[PDB]
Amino acid sequence: DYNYGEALQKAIMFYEFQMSGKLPDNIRNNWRGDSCLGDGSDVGLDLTGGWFDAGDHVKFNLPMAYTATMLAWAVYEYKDALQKSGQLGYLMDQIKWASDYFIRCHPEKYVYYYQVGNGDMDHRWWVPAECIDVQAPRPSYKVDLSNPGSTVTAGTAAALAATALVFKDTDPAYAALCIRHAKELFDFAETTMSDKGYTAALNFYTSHSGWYDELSWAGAWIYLADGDETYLEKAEKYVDKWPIESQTTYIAYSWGHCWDDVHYGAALLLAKITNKSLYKEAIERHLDYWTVGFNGQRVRYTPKGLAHLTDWGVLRHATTTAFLACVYSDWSECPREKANIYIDFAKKQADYALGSSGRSYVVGFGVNPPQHPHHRTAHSSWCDSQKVPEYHRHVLYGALVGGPDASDAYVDDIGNYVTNQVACDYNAGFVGLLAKMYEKYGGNPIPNFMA
Numbered sequence: 198d199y200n201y202g203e204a205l206q207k208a209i210m211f212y213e214f215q216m217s218g219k220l221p222d223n224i225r226n227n228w229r230g231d232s233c234l235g236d237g238s239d240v241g242l243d244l245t246g247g248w249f250d251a252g253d254h255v256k257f258n259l260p261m262a263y264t265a266t267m268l269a270w271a272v273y274e275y276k277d278a279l280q281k282s283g284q285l286g287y288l289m290d291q292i293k294w295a296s297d298y299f300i301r302c303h304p305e306k307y308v309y310y311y312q313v314g315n316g317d318m319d320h321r322w323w324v325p326a327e328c329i330d331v332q333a334p335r336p337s338y339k340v341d342l343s344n345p346g347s348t349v350t351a352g353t354a355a356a357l358a359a360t361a362l363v364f365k366d367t368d369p370a371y372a373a374l375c376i377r378h379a380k381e382l383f384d385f386a387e388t389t390m391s392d393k394g395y396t397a398a399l400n401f402y403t404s405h406s407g408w409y410d411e412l413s414w415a416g417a418w419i420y421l422a423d424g425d426e427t428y429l430e431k432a433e434k435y436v437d438k439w440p441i442e443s444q445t446t447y448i449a450y451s452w453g454h455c456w457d458d459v460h461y462g463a464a465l466l467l468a469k470i471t472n473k474s475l476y477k478e479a480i481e482r483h484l485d486y487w488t489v490g491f492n493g494q495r496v497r498y499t500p501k502g503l504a505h506l507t508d509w510g511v512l513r514h515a516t517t518t519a520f521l522a523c524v525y526s527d528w529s530e531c532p533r534e535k536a537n538i539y540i541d542f543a544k545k546q547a548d549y550a551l552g553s554s555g556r557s558y559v560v561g562f563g564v565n566p567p568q569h570p571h572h573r574t575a576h577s578s579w580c581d582s583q584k585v586p587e588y589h590r591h592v593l594y595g596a597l598v599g600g601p602d603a604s605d606a607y608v609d610d611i612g613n614y615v616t617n618q619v620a621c622d623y624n625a626g627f628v629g630l631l632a633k634m635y636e637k638y639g640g641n642p643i644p645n646f647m648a
């Protein structure tokens with residue numbers, strides 16, 4: 198069996214490498230430094246902090262909020278296992294880092310900054326984070342009542358709500374602040390019902406599923422953290438505008454939970470909150486189709502056992518769906534026979550990410566892991582070139598790469614930003630999955646681990 202403690206410890210550490218702004222003194226690596234300290238200067242605000250999205254240095258607040266919410270979800274479900282591993286403190290520190298940044302992006306009730314950095318310009322430069330802000334300006338982008346962005350504002354509300362949920366027992370003052378910001382951002386999103394202003398992320402993180410599942414997503418997290426039934430009532434109200442499986446009348450089920458489509462996770466949380474069969478059927482339709490099949494149709498699988506939804510961030514999809522299987526299979530209302538099927542599914546997907554096919558797909562872990570992730574700072578080029586140096590100067594511990602194709606084929610290639618891609622959302626659900634696997638199978642993390 199694989200060391201799920203070591204994997205978990207590193208999958209969490211991966212986020213330290215993504216940090217932007219003035220780093221705290223408690224960081225565990227010696228190669229990341231302060232960066233992009235002027236973020237927000239163009240609008241008179243302190244918009245520093247947060248995570249760089251992927252191997253670039255743009256801060257995209259839609260996938261960032263998604264990542265924070267999933268990280269908080271891991272704590273919510275597997276707090277005790279995360280403490281026993283000794284990594285709960287690090288994971289909590291990262292959640293607050295992202296949420297602190299979301300709060301700074303919300304200086305007024307109906308003004309939310311959703312992006313720092315221009316996508317096209319930032320991607321022209323292959324330079325480390327500590328040098329990026331000298332090469333090109335980093336403008337701030339915002340939405341308001343006249344140019345609204347309901348998807349991203351609702352997504353950030355979910356993140357702050359989930360943050361308040363896990364910080365309420367340790368820092369109630371901080372939890373109260375996050376809740377206040379979440380309900381404001383929720384009201385902002387619900388009032389505008391539009392993405393007319395969400396324009397800086399076009400061609401990078403444009404959603405087509407709609408902001409309504411983001412509303413149910415946020416409404417459930419607000420209720421779990423605050424108990425205000427008003428936001429549970431609003432969550433169930435917008436279920437009828439979730440995506441529907443084509444050629445049917447079911448709630449969509451043949452995709453997966455991801456930064457673009459959160460109605461999957463929303464259905465799981467609403468099932469646990471309300472115990473209604475509407476949500477239980479929807480999530481069980483999804484997890485059934487992803488395992489044994491539903492109505493004679495089944496998600497594609499590679500011969501080596503990987504659930505292969507699509508070629509873009511395939512492992513992000515498998516590990517994330519696997520995490521949902523963990524949470525639901527551990528639920529008391531889950532049919533027992535379906536529980537064993539779902540959890541065996543989760544272990545196989547986890548083991549595939551860790552090296553069941555013959556090689557780890559987690560940088561710096563296991564056998565023959567990827568060594569050339571499409572990541573500017575870990576590569577650390579001295580001349581604006583992906584090819585120079587020919588080896589990464591730094592190890593991007595814990596990063597889950599895009600993954601192999603449908604025939605289990607994969608090759609290291611710093612230039613392939615699909616197969617060798619890494620990103621915040623790729624590791625989000627992965628943490629939750631490993632937390633469960635550690636709880637069940639153990640495997641001790643590296644003591645005193647430093648990068």
Ligand SMILES: OC[C@H]1O[C@@H](O[C@H]2[C@H](O)[C@@H](O)[C@H](O)O[C@@H]2CO)[C@H](O)[C@@H](O)[C@@H]1O
Nearest residue numbers: 251252253254320400401571614618620
């Ligand atoms: O936005 C996804 C991905 O983009 C990467 O930049 C690409 C860019 O999208 C493409 O149009 C251009 O031709 O090539 C660059 C890379 O050479 C970016 O490097 C990634 O960080 C980002 O995740």
Ligand SMILES: [Ca+2]
Nearest residue numbers: 406407408457
């Ligand atoms: Ca959506």
